[PDB]
Amino acid sequence: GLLDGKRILVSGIITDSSIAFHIARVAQEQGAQLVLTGFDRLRLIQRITDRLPAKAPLLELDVQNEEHLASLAGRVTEAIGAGNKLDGVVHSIGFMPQTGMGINPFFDAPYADVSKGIHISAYSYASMAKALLPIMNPGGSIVGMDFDPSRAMPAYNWMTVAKSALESVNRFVAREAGKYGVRSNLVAAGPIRTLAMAIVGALGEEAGAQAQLLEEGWDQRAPIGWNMKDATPVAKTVCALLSDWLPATTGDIIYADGGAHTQLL
Amino acid sequence: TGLLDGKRILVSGIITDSSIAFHIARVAQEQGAQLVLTGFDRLRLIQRITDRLPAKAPLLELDVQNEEHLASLAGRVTEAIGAGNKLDGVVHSIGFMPQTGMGINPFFDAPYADVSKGIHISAYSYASMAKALLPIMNPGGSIVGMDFDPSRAMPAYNWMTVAKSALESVNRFVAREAGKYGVRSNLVAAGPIRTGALGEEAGAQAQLLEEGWDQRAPIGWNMKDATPVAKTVCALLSDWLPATTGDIIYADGGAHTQLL
C-alpha cells in the first residue's frame, strides 16, 4: 500500500463521521500500522474505532493536559514496542466554545473561551510535535487539519482566527521538525459534515443558514465540485502527505477543497 | 489644510519616545488631529513621555486585559473630547509576548499561559478596543493596527509571529463589524524599527534581518526612523483611502515584494 509498514499516530476520532476516522481507515487500507489517541469519551471512541479495518491501540490524550503530553511519547513506544519509532503523526483536533462562533456576536466571545479554542486548535499542534518528534523516524511526516482562514466569513468567527494561528504555528513546527528530517504540513479541507456539522442544524438559526450558503457556494466554485458528505478525498490527501510522495514539501498547506479557493465566482 | 485637520483620534501604545505610537501621535498632531491617548501601566511615567508630544493630550488608563477598563473606555473618552463629539480614528499600537515566547527561548519551550497572554494583548485586544470604541466613532472613521508580516516563519519572532497571524485574521473580522458603522479597519505592516543584550547569536540574527531588509527594499529601509511608518498610519486615518478595509498596507520599503 501507499503507507506500507509505516507507523502512524492519529488523533481526533470522536465519531465515524470524524475526518480522523476516515484518515485512519484509508491509512490502514494502505498498509499503515496505527496508534490512535482519544479525548474524554474513550468508551465511545474505543467502540467507534472497532469498526476500522484493523485493530489499533487507543491512547488517552487531552492536549490541554500537560501530564498527558509529557507521558505521551512513552505510552506510544510501549504500544509500538521499544526499538520502533513513528513515521507519521496526524493532528485532527479542533474546538471553539459556542460563544466564539455562530450567531453569537464576534465581539461577545470571552477571551477565556477564545483562549481555550486557540490552545486546542492551534497551540497543541506544536505541543504534539514537541512530544512526538523525539520518537519519529527521518523521512517522517506531521499533518494537521486546517480550514482556509485567509479571508473572513460569517459564523466561523474565532475558529477562523485559531486556524490563522495554526498556519503560523505549522511554519514554525516545520523549522523544528526539519532537524529530525521530518516534514510538517496542513491539509486545508472544504466543509465536511462531521459532528459539529451541528452548526448547519445549534449555533443559532442564521448561522446555520450561512453555513448552508458556504457549503452551496463551495460546490459551485469548485471546478471539480465538492461533496461534503464524502470525507474520502480529504483522507487520501492526508495519506499523500504521510507517504514518501511529497518529500520536498514542508511548512506548507495542501488544499483538498475541490479547488474552490482558487476561484472567485 | 492639515491631513487630519479637525479629526479626533485615540492612540494607544506610547511607552517611550521611541515607541512607534509616539511618532504616530507626533505626526497626527503635526497634521492637525486632536488626540486622546491611552496608557497601560505606570501612568505617571508615560505622562512625562506624552508631555514631549507636539501638543498636550488627555491620558486615559487602559489595560487591555481588564474588561472593566474596556467597558468604561468609551465614556471616559467622550468626557475627554467633550460629550457631543466622537472619534474619527483609533490607533492600536500594542504588542506583548513574554521572553519565553520570543527571542532566544526554543519555540517548543513556551508555556501556553505566556503565549495566551501574548495573544490576548497582541491580537484579541484589537477586537476589544473596536468593541469598546465603535459606538462612539463617526462614519468614515478609521481603525489602524500595527503588524509585522507573519506570512513566513523567521528566527526569534516565534510566538509573536503567531500572534500577528492571529491579529490579521482578527482585523478581517473587525472590518465586518466596523462596516456597520461606516468605519474602516486596517493594519500597517511595518519593517523593523529600532525601538547584544540577548547574546551573540541573537545580535547577529537582528543585524542580518536589518541588513537584509534594507538590501531587499527597492527604496531601502531606515530602521532608525519611524517617520515613514507614522505617515502611513496617518494616510489610513485620513480620507484618502476610503475604499480600503480588512486590509494590510505594507510600510516596509517594499521588502516583502522581493526575494533577494
Added chain:
Amino acid sequence: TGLLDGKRILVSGIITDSSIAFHIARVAQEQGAQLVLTGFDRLRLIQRITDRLPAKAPLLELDVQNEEHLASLAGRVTEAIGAGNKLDGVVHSIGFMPQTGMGINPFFDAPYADVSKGIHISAYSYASMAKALLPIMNPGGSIVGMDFDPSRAMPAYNWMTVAKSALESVNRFVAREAGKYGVRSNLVAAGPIRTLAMSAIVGGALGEEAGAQAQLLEEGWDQRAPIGWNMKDATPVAKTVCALLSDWLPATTGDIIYADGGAHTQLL
C-alpha cells in the same frame, strides 16, 4: 493646501469622462497637481473630454505599442513642463484585451496574437512607460497602475485576468528599477467600475448569460465588501491613487493597494 500641491504628474488612459483616469486626473487637479495628459488614438475627441477637467493640461500622444512614441515621450513631456522641471508622478490607467480573450469567447478559443496584444498594452507597457519616464522623475516620486485582483479565476475576465497577473509581477520588477531613482511603483486593485462597456454588458449587449454573471459579480462584490461597493462611483478609487501619488505612503513599493470596499478580504 491640497494633497498634491506643487507636483507634476503624467496621466494616461482618459478616453471618456467616465474613465477612471479621468476621475484620477480631476481629483489630482483638485489637490493642486500640475497635470500632463497622454492620448492614444482619438486625439481630438479626448481633448474635448480633457477640457471638461477643472484645469486645462497639455495633451500628448502616446501609443504604448509605438516604440518611437515611447522614445520621444520624455522630451515631449519636458517640452510641456519646461526644462529644469521634472515629474513627481505617473499614472498608468491603460488596459486592453480583445473580445476573443475576454467575455463570452471560450478561454480556449483566444488566439495568442490577440492575447499577446492584450498583454503588451495591459502589462508590458507598465515597464515601457516606466522606462521612458523614470529618467525625468524626481526622487520621492510615484508611479501607479490600475489593477483588477487576478489572484483567483472568474467568469468572463479570462485572459484579461492573465494580463493583470502579469502586470502585478511586472510592477514588482519596475519597483526595483524605480528604486534607483527614489521612486516608488504601486498598483491600485480597484473594485468593478461601471465603464460604458461595463454598463453595456449589464444591459445585455453580451447576451443573457453574460449579463447575468455581471449582475452576480457586482451584487456579490457589494455584499462581500464590509463597507459596501458602489460600481457607479470611481471617486474612492481616484483618491486612493492620489494617496499613492502623495508623500503619505513613502515606504510602500512593488505593492498593491486594494480600493475595493474590502471585498477581497471576505469569503462571503
Added chain:
Amino acid sequence: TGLLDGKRILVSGIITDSSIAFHIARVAQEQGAQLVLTGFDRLRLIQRITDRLPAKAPLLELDVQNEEHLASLAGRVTEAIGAGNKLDGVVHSIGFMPQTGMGINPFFDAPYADVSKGIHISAYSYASMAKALLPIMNPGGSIVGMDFDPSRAMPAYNWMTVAKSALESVNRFVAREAGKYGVRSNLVAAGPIRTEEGWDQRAPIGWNMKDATPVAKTVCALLSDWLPATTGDIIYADGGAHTQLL
C-alpha cells in the same frame, strides 16, 4: 502495485537526461505508467535521451508555438496509444525566455517580441496543450505544469518571472475547463534544479539542487489518485523554502 499503475500519461519537456521531465518520466515508468513523450527541436537527439528511460515510449513532435502540431496532436497520441484509449495524465514541463529577458540583461531593455515569445511558450502553451488533450482525457485525469514561485521579484529571473506569474493565472482558468471533463489541473513550484545557495539554508528540510527526484515524485503524486480534491492549485516542492523568510 505502482502508484500510477496502468495510467496513460503524456510527458513533454525532455531535452537531456537532466531535464525535470526526464526524471518525471523515469519515476512515472517505475510506478507503472505507460508514457507518451513529446519533443521540440532536435527530435533525433532527444530520442537518444529517451532511450535511457526504463521502458520504451512512442516519441511525438510538438512545438507549442505550432498550430499544426497542436491541431494534430490528440490524433497522433490516440494513434500511439490505440483507438479506444484515452490519457489519464499530462505533464507540461516547458519553458523559454530569450537571453535579453533574463540574467544580467536589463529588465527595461528586453523587446516585447522577446517577452511575447517567452510568455507564449512558457504560459499560453499550458492552455493550448490543455485545449488539445482534454478531449482525449479520462475522467479523474490530471494535468501538471512546472512552476517557479514568482510571487516576489528576484535578480536574474526577470521576464521569466513575469511568464510564471502569467502561468499561475492560466492554470486557474484551465482548471475551470478541465473540471468539465472531471480532470484536475495543478502546478508544481519547484526549487532550483541544475539544468540560490540560500535555498538550502531557508528550506527546513534542506534542498539539494542536483537532485530532481523529489520534484519528480511530487509531480507523480499529482498525477496519482492521491490528490483527488486539488485543482487550480500550486504544490510547492522546494524544501519548504518559500514558507520561511530567513
